[PDB]
Write a protein that binds this DNA or RNA. Structure first.
Lengths: 732, 366, 150, 283
DNA sequence: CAAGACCAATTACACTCTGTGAGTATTAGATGAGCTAGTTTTT
RNA sequence: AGAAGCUGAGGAGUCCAGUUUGACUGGAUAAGGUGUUCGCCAUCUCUAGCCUCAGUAAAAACUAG
């Protein structure tokens, strides 16, 4: 039961300390060299415990003449076992003659009385020092202590990528070491006599054959381990994933009546395994873990209170991590290694325990994927998932693809708690301004949400001295407090602001909240897409629909077009003709040349008519942007949606105009005017294709995208800069 | 790293020592009138003028040059990431403790040793014609000829901003030698500036023996360093270093503990008690906090006065916040290393609560 | 991603032309993968130029080879495609539900402890559009499924 | 290390699919400077002489290199590649070629290596072992300059030290007969408490007739723990009788040799007295 | 006083002789303002 | 045999010791109790154990729950 492993100036470790070990400690990270170096350090320490001639480990830097490996063992169970009066055994005395002997005979008759309260824990520290001249020495100069520590807390290494099925060395080693039977009392002559009696044509026939065989193969006598292995093999009736699972089950079962506390390290348990196989492996491990556990009402034979051995995993599969988190719960941890700026392995504990049972139960592959990440962008909304996972946009920015987009609300963020793992997995939480401040038309006054007040309270730097530079934070906090005034006049029936600008407030909030890994947008997600500079392209997109997604319904196009022209007027009744001619159809049949020309002319006339009507009904050239924004579930600068405006009875004429366009003119876009309709993906793809057709160089394309989409490109560039700043750290 | 002529052209002397470079002018030394000679006890501190090219050169050296040269892990002072708590941490595993101090550490550093230590990291090429090299040009901004110490060479000043990094770099051979010697005998060695702390986990009298002192002196004599016998401390199972108590009951692997004695925390307890007794702030800062207004108040220019009350509020708030920062640095060190007594932890938690309450009271009063 | 980039660097189709572009057919590449990451990246990056083969077995014991749907007509589904969608390929029984409450109920660890057989079936939250895109009916023998609705 | 290198050749566990010692010797033992040669001109010439137009092969090599991300070759690897291109070619034969190459390279350099060959006779006919020793001797004598033997191909460079680990009397016989005064035979054996000795067994003879007559019987004495020296064939008949040796399973470990006084003087059993005990039986 | 122990990092043969390691021998809105500054270590 | 010492200059009241009938010199308020490696140490409890003027450079860790 180790509690601390410290490595200083060896391999890739400068000063690395590992603590709070649990049963199912899992190791993840892109720095495989760090995992290999840690395994090498552990194996070297345990080899030097057993006095094996091995090559000393290399130093991290040659400007240090000392390389230290420190192991701390929790010798609390063993001390309690050997202290009890009714444990007068040779091995128990040997344990309470080398480990718990120097700390007891040198104390008075008062210190020990405080060690029998069944509440304190005893720690044993052993340090291995490698000198510059390839000389190794220990803190305690007693080989018996080291041998006893190795026996009591053995280390097992299991490799699955290179495993030999024919050889079962770990199984037989565990069987020989973990036993409670004495095999020295077995009489070999008696066993041979019994075997001869079992198969005897005459009295004493197999004895002479055995004697001849022994004489003709006379070699060194069997050792105790060989004898017990042979006895087990003749006693039992039978000799990748299945092998490892059987070995783990055997080790768990054996360590139920023994005070030996093994340490198990398993490297890549999922190589060549189906995801269901890995999940079943973790499930079987949890089942064997829980079968031998007794808690209060759970009792009876077959259940033990013996502490379980520590198991270490090195997994690159999200399935194993997901099952470990879901099943074990509080009895597991995740260690992310990564690297440092100059180059040095780290170890950080990632949050794996959740106080919400719903989140633990609905835990899925995405949540386990978040731990195998180098940058997470947390968004509230599926529209952001559509926008930031757009393939046509990520190819132009080959640095934001390394970031993973996760949709999470406040509860999911609180459960995940990204702030716990900040230097290992950088994250940004993208939210909207509406989550900080709110506005009311009836009562013309700003209001502050509890999230904003909590952020301010977190940013109130009280209990602080005077330092240069940290003087404007208080002024910013005071301004964010006093912006709660009711002096904010709104024009255009409560849609815009007469003097106030949310851009400056959003910029100030982003500047002050950069340190809290939060980015607040000026408007909703549809605001960054439907803006003034995107009006042409967006319009073209609409035209694309009129040219692509709407086809003639009649099987004969020429006759139907002629009938409509002779029946409906081409100019005054153009809208009814367009509605009655073109419908929804995936297929795009090719018509005659004259029919194609007529259809193209009709489509161009309809596009011109809609453009003219849009430019005539609205005059400021900006109200159309707000109309389109509210059409696709957007918000105004007053933080009001179309539904909220309808419920509040504000901008009745605007709602009437929106209804007229929806039910009269832009009826074909009605299916796409809702969220989760995929209009974002289509619009981004069309815009990027058009820009690629226009601009040749990719830099020109990126500049044009920055011009048309300032906020999206700003966020992408900020995330890319954050990733590239720590690129040398979060990369193997 | 390696610094060539072009590196010094526009990184370490981008604007200050530029006119000398172009017009074939050798970089001058530090004049007597360009430094102040402040005194505190029997110590002389050389303070370089803030508005001077040498100060800018020293800042650039400390930011770019004297920050990449490798150092020894035993040097826990003047290093980014080093602290006194990290200086005392490794000795928790030991049962016997020994403390030594190098006498006049900065004044005994020969300039030739500094030159030979900085030579590998600076290219051996002439800077200003065939008149002055690049190594001596760098050294001219680091050292200073002390008139007090006569014409004994360029002594590294005790007040220059480049002195600590240069001292830690030059004291790397000695750190390696002492660390190797202690490793051969199972002794943990840690150095803070010029205080060397040695810890022995084994039940041996090596640290209390004269042989250890003789060996340390013999090693230090290579570069001309001595150790004063006034503050040589060799103890067992407990050692106090400036109020920091390291205690290990002994054994074959027992873990020691680090705490702070009541002498170290006496001042803050006195301040809190005075605040509890509603003592006026006039005599709580001029006696306990040793901060007091000078006679040349308000720069002899204003007439409103009344700045004493706000000064005695501000400085008291600053002292309470700073000592709170000290205590929470201690508790964070405990969280990182787990080598601090639990009772001391709860005591400092209570003291932190009291300090927070008193700060809140003071801010409410203002 | 690098495979797809080098695949698309040497493609000369429609208006895309110029030096360094070739119209020669690409060699056939077969992958034996057990990781959802490779499968999801292959799907999202290639689309019409990839297929997924499910092997399984027969009743008496005999290898099968079937094709699982991997081409989606919805660009939104292709972009949103994540590890949860890629996990359905590596499944033996999919339970399709509309609603997060059903996901909470059918993923309950305490309930699944008493029913080990149902623990082998994975539950996916899909509406009618997602069901149409996935098209579970294409691969019925390979991946049995049930759609639970109200 | 670089002036007195050590080479070890294990014939029993040698591989015919690699030439590591040969390429190591070629790279280390050279008097040229494979640095003036520049990759650009090599390529340019290959492109000009290969096929098609000018620059096609250069473009092919450039596009292969730009997409492989490989570190440049070391000097040893580069010279090995140059030698491989410049040459037209890729157990006993391998050993003979390695020794011949090493001698030829070490005839024009002051580097004097030391070779240790373990079991040079595994899987070899006795004729093959004798031929191996004869070929090595011919290589040794070809480069030897001595008075009249002067001219091209005759050098005075001292030859490298070569150590054998042989269990075959054929190799020992050929080394004794051919090399003569330039060979040494070392017998190890053990001590009473257990410790390895090193003694020199007399292998140089002042009688040329004994050297020419020297056969497998004489070489078998070197691999003997006890020699019984006799003066006639009747003693050989008596002491080699199988029936007599069957009843005494201790005298069969001693070999009987028929030797007169001249043969005894040439052999000189007294030199290796502590290594090979002997008894001289005379009337 | 005087002292052993003084950091680490910084593929190669030119030569006349083509074989030798010398022998020689070639050879050439610009004008009342008006302001402080943490704990601790080294020291 | 050389180190060390030491932020400096002081002042008011009182005690001890010495000389001395009358003044000077030296030491002193982190107080008290307990244990000690006797250390310039540790721990516990209070009412928290004097004042004035000058001087205060440099580098690191720390402004958490």
């Amino acid at each position: 039961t180790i509690e601390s492993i410290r490595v200083k100036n060896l391999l890739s470790f400068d000063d690395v300390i590992l603590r709070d070990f649990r049963d199912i400690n899992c190791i993840i990270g892109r720095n495989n060299v760090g995992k290999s170096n840690l395994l090498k350090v552990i194996r070297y320490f345990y080899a030097k415990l057993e006095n094996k001639k091995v090559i000393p480990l290399d130093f991290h830097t040659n400007y240090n003449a000392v390389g230290e490996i420190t192991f701390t063992f929790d010798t609390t169970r063993i001390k309690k076992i050997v202290t009890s009066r009714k444990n007068n055994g040779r091995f128990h005395k040997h344990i309470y003659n080398t480990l718990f002997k120097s700390s007891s005979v040198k104390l008075n008759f008062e210190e020990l009385i405080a060690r029998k309260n069944s509440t304190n824990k005893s720690f044993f520290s052993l340090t291995l020092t490698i000198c510059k001249d390839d000389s190794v020495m220990w803190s305690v100069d007693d080989p018996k202590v080291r041998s006893l520590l190795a026996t009591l807390y053995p280390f097992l290494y299991i490799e699955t990528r290179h495993i030999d099925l024919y050889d079962w060395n770990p199984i037989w080693k565990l069987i020989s070491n973990l036993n409670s039977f004495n095999f020295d009392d077995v009489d070999h002559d008696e066993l041979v006599n019994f075997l001869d009696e079992k198969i005897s044509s005459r009295k004493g026939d197999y004895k002479k054959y055995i004697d001849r065989v022994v004489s003709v193969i006379d070699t060194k006598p069997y050792t105790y381990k060989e004898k017990v292995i042979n006895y087990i093999k003749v006693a039992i009736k039978g000799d990748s994933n299945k092998f490892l699972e059987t070995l783990l089950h055997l080790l768990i079962t054996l360590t139920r009546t023994e005070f030996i506390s093994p340490i198990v390290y398993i490297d890549e348990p999922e190589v060549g395994l189906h995801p269901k196989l890995a999940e079943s492996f973790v499930s079987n491990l949890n089942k064997i873990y829980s079968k031998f556990k007794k808690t209060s009402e759970l009792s009876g034979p077959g259940r033990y209170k013996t502490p379980y051995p520590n198991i270490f995993y090195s997994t690159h599969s999200p399935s194993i991590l997901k099952q470990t988190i879901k099943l074990f719960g509080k009895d597991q941890q995740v260690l992310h290694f990564s690297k440092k700026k100059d180059g040095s392995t780290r170890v950080n504990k990632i949050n794996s325990t959740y106080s919400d049972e719903r989140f633990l139960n609905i835990f899925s592959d995405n949540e386990a994927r978040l731990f195998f990440s180098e940058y997470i962008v947390f968004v509230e909304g599926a529209t952001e998932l559509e926008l930031f996972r757009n393939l046509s946009l990520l190819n132009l920015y080959p640095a934001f693809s390394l970031a993973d987009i996760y949709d999470a609300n406040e509860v999911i963020l609180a459960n995940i708690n990204p702030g716990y793992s900040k230097a290992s997995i950088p994250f940004v939480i993208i939210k909207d301004i509406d989550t900080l401040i709110d506005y009311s038309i009836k009562t013309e006054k700003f209001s502050l949400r509890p999230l904003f007040e909590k952020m301010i309270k977190e940013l109130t730097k009280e209990f602080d001295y005077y330092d240069t530079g940290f003087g404007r934070v208080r002024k910013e906090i005071d301004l964010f407090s006093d912006i709660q005034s009711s002096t904010k006049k709104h024009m255009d029936s409560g849609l815009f602001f007469k003097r106030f600008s949310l851009h400056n407030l959003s910029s100030r909030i982003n500047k002050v909240s950069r340190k809290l890994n939060r980015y607040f947008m000026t408007t909703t997600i549809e605001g960054a897409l439907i803006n003034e500079q995107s009006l042409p392209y967006f319009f073209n997109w609409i035209g694309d629909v009129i040219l692509t997604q709407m086809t003639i319904n009649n099987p004969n196009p020429d006759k139907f077009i002629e009938a409509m022209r002779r029946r409906y007027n081409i100019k005054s009744q153009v809208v009814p003709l367009f509605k009655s001619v073109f419908c929804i159809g995936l297929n795009h049949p090719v018509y005659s040349s004259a029919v194609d020309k007529q259809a193209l002319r009709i489509k161009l006339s309809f596009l011109n008519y809609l453009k003219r009507k849009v430019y005539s009904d609205f005059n400021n050239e900006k109200e159309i942007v707000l109309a389109l924004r509210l059409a696709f579930g957007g918000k105004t600068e007053t933080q009001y949606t179309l539904d909220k405006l309808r419920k509040d009875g504000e901008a009745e004429l605007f709602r009437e105009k929106i209804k007229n366009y929806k039910n009269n003119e832009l009826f074909f876009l009605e299916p796409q005017m809702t969220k989760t309709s995929g209009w974002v993906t289509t619009f981004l793809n069309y815009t990027i294709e058009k820009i690629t057709s226009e601009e040749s160089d990719d830099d020109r394309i990126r500049q044009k995208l920055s011009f048309i989409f300032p906020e999206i490109i700003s966020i992408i560039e900020q995330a890319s800069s954050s990733i590239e700043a720590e690129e040398s750290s979060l990369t193997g | 790293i390696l610094v060539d002529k072009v590196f010094y052209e526009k990184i370490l002397s981008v604007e200050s020592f530029k006119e000398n470079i172009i017009t074939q002018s050798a970089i001058p030394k530090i004049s007597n009138k360009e430094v102040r000679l402040i005194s505190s006890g029997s110590k002389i501190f050389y303070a370089i003028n803030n508005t001077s090219p040498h100060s800018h050169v020293q800042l650039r050296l400390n930011r770019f040059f004297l920050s990449h040269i490798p150092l020894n892990s035993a040097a826990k002072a003047f290093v980014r990431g080093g602290s006194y708590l990290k200086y005392l941490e490794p000795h928790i595993y030991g049962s016997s403790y020994c403390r030594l101090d190098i006498s006049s550490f900065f004044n005994n550093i020969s300039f030739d040793d500094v030159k030979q230590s900085l030579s590998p990291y600076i290219k051996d090429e002439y800077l200003i014609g065939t008149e002055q090299k690049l190594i001596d040009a760098i050294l001219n901004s680091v050292g200073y000829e002390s008139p007090i110490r006569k014409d004994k060479g360029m002594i590294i000043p005790m007040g220059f901003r480049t002195s600590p990094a240069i001292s830690n770099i030059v004291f790397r051979k000695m750190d390696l030698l002492i660390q190797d010697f202690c490793a051969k005998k199972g002794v943990i060695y840690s150095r803070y500036a010029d205080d060397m702390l040695f810890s022995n986990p084994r039940e041996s009298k090596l640290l209390m023996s004269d042989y250890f002192i003789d060996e340390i002196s013999s090693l230090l004599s290579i570069m001309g360093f001595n150790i004063n016998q006034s503050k040589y401390i060799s103890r067992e199972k407990e050692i106090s270093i400036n109020g920091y108590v390291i205690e290990n009951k002994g054994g074959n692997g027992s873990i020691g503990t680090i705490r702070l004695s009541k002498s170290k925390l006496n001042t803050v307890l006195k301040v809190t008690h005075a605040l509890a007794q509603n003592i006026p702030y006039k005599n709580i800062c001029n006696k306990y906090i040793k901060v007091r207004l000078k006679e040349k108040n308000i720069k002899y220019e204003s007439k409103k006065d009344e700045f004493e009350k706000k000064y005695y509020r501000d400085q008291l708030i600053n002292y309470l916040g700073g000592y709170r920062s000290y205590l929470i640095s201690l508790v964070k060190f405990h969280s990182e290393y787990k080598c601090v007594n639990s009772d001391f932890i709860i005591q400092i938690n209570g003291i932190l609560n009291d300090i927070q309450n008193h700060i809140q009271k003071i801010k409410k009063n203002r």
